[PDB]
Ligand binder design. Structure first.
Ligand SMILES: [Mn+2]
Length: 235
């Protein structure tokens, strides 16, 4: 009674510890997503083979040379994903996987933007990947930036760089899917102790044409990381 895919995004804050990988493996099994986007694996390109998660053996990774950044898209053993293209960031800040599930195209960009210059860094990735964006695109991960005023407890208006980022997303027919489903949401995914500020810096952005297929979306607090996850249910 179940042909809905669920895609999940989570900044995990490092996966070099095997015991930590087992906690993530159990958590993923509980959440039972079809597709899983992880940020900050902290796995070097040498160590990517260490990432094993029972039940999610299709794993696509982009990593740098230090124990820094690192992203991964995991696909459930129960989901038939046929890939056509995988594009990896050399520094491990993003990976794009294109393919299909059950004859329907899906383009997933998993992104981990740097703390500094985040909206400009994302705008540049969009430009670099311009030819690969389409109307079946999901962009999810740790943008390290609000996209609109309610993504921060301070309710500060977004900066010019963020505004230029949103214009570029608009040119690609991409929307903030979470806030379109929950326009007055005041939920958060990260807490900054130096300023006692709460912010939603993790995002699910996607093609306008996918909106009708998005059933549910919600945030998931956890004991694994300094970020809460976000889950999307798709038709
Ligand atoms: Mn971290």
């Amino acid at each position: 009674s179940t042909s809905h895919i669920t895609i999940l995004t989570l900044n995990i804050n490092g996966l070099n510890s095997a015991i930590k990988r087992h906690r993530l493996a159990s958590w993923i099994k509980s959440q039972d997503p079809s597709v899983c986007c992880i940020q900050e694996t902290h796995l070097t390109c040498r160590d990517t083979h260490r990432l094993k998660i029972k039940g999610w053996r299709k794993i696509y990774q982009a990593n740098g040379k230090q124990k820094k950044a690192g992203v991964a898209i995991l696909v459930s053993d129960k989901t038939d994903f046929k890939p056509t293209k995988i594009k990896r960031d050399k520094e491990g800040h993003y990976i794009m996987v294109k393919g299909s599930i059950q004859q329907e195209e899906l383009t997933i960009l998993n992104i981990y933007a740097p703390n500094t210059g985040a909206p400009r860094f994302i705008k540049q990735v969009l430009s670099d990947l311009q030819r690969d964006l389409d109307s079946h695109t999901l962009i999810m991960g740790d943008f390290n930036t609000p996209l609109s005023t309610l993504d921060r407890s301070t309710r500060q208006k977004v900066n010019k760089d963020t505004q230029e980022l949103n214009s570029a997303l608009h040119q690609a027919d991409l929307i903030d899917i979470y806030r379109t489903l929950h326009p007055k949401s005041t939920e958060y995914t990260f807490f900054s102790a130096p300023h006692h500020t709460y912010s939603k810096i993790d995002h699910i952005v996607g093609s306008k044409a996918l909106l009708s297929k998005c059933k549910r979306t919600e945030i998931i607090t956890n004991y694994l990381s300094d970020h809460s996850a976000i889950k999307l249910e798709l038709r």
